[PDB]
Design an enzyme around this catalytic site. Structure first.
Site, short mmCIF file in Angstrom:
data_model
loop_
_atom_site.label_atom_id
_atom_site.label_comp_id
_atom_site.label_asym_id
_atom_site.label_seq_id
_atom_site.Cartn_x
_atom_site.Cartn_y
_atom_site.Cartn_z
N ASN A 24 -17.03 13.75 -8.05
CA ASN A 24 -16.59 14.72 -9.06
C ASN A 24 -15.10 14.66 -9.35
O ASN A 24 -14.64 15.54 -10.11
CB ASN A 24 -17.02 16.15 -8.64
CG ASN A 24 -18.53 16.27 -8.65
OD1 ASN A 24 -19.15 15.90 -9.67
ND2 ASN A 24 -19.13 16.69 -7.55
N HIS B 255 -8.64 9.73 2.39
CA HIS B 255 -7.61 8.69 2.39
C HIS B 255 -8.40 7.42 2.81
O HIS B 255 -9.46 7.46 3.45
CB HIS B 255 -6.55 8.80 3.50
CG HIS B 255 -5.63 9.94 3.38
ND1 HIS B 255 -4.77 10.31 4.40
CD2 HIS B 255 -5.41 10.81 2.37
CE1 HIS B 255 -4.07 11.39 3.99
NE2 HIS B 255 -4.44 11.70 2.76
N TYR C 88 -7.33 2.01 7.01
CA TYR C 88 -7.08 0.54 6.94
C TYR C 88 -7.37 -0.27 8.17
O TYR C 88 -7.23 -1.54 8.15
CB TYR C 88 -5.54 0.38 6.67
CG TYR C 88 -5.19 0.90 5.32
CD1 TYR C 88 -5.50 0.08 4.21
CD2 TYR C 88 -4.61 2.15 5.11
CE1 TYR C 88 -5.23 0.52 2.92
CE2 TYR C 88 -4.36 2.61 3.82
CZ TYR C 88 -4.65 1.78 2.74
OH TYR C 88 -4.43 2.24 1.48
N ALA D 195 -8.19 -4.05 13.39
CA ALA D 195 -7.01 -4.40 14.19
C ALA D 195 -6.70 -3.27 15.17
O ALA D 195 -5.93 -3.49 16.12
CB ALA D 195 -5.80 -4.68 13.31
N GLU E 96 -11.37 8.29 5.25
CA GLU E 96 -11.18 9.27 6.35
C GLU E 96 -11.00 10.65 5.71
O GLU E 96 -10.36 10.74 4.63
CB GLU E 96 -10.06 8.92 7.28
CG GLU E 96 -8.64 9.20 7.00
CD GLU E 96 -7.71 9.55 8.12
OE1 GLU E 96 -7.94 8.86 9.16
OE2 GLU E 96 -6.85 10.41 8.08
N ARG F 34 -10.38 14.20 12.22
CA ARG F 34 -10.89 13.49 11.07
C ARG F 34 -12.19 12.74 11.37
O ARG F 34 -12.43 12.36 12.52
CB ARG F 34 -9.92 12.30 10.68
CG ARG F 34 -8.46 12.78 10.50
CD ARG F 34 -8.22 13.46 9.18
NE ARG F 34 -6.75 13.78 9.10
CZ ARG F 34 -6.34 15.02 9.43
NH1 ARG F 34 -7.23 15.96 9.78
NH2 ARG F 34 -5.03 15.32 9.41
N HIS G 82 -5.42 13.54 16.06
CA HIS G 82 -3.98 13.42 16.37
C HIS G 82 -3.75 14.09 17.74
O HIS G 82 -2.70 13.88 18.43
CB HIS G 82 -3.08 14.18 15.37
CG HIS G 82 -2.92 13.46 14.07
ND1 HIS G 82 -2.36 12.20 14.01
CD2 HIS G 82 -3.25 13.78 12.79
CE1 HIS G 82 -2.34 11.77 12.74
NE2 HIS G 82 -2.87 12.72 12.00
#
Length: 114
Positions: free
Chosen positions: A32, A41, A44, A47, A62, A85, A101
């Site tokens: 929407n 977000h 990436y 790794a 995320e 998250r 975090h």
């Protein structure tokens, strides 16, 4: 992978419903054109050394993991995303991991929830 029954993110315990709600919420939001506080977000990463995804290839997104979800924030009503998250596979909605975090070595750092 399948959504776990519960997840522990630095003391905050979330159920399978909280997790699913976050993913479904994020997908609906994107569909929407509503991106609360500019989430989801992009995640990436492969790794990453402390985050193991239980989903396949990217792209990965995320979104905040909160109680009484899904997370929402508005133009004149800011709501904090908090420290937790969910990571999901952008194109399929497949669950990948829960991160936080809380308990990380720096304010911008992440560790995996248990």
């Amino acid at each position: 992978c399948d959504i776990p029954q519960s997840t522990n993110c630095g003391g905050n315990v979330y159920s399978n419903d909280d997790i699913n709600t976050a993913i479904q919420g994020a997908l609906d939001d994107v569909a929407n054109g509503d991106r609360p506080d500019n989430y989801p977000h992009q995640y990436y990463x492969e790794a990453s050394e402390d985050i193991t995804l239980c989903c396949g290839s990217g792209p990965w997104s995320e979104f905040p993991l909160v109680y009484n979800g899904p997370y929402y924030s508005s133009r004149d009503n800011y709501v904090s995303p908090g420290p937790d998250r969910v990571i999901y596979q952008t194109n399929t909605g497949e669950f990948c991991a829960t991160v936080t975090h809380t308990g990380a070595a720096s304010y911008d750092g992440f560790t995996q929830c248990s």
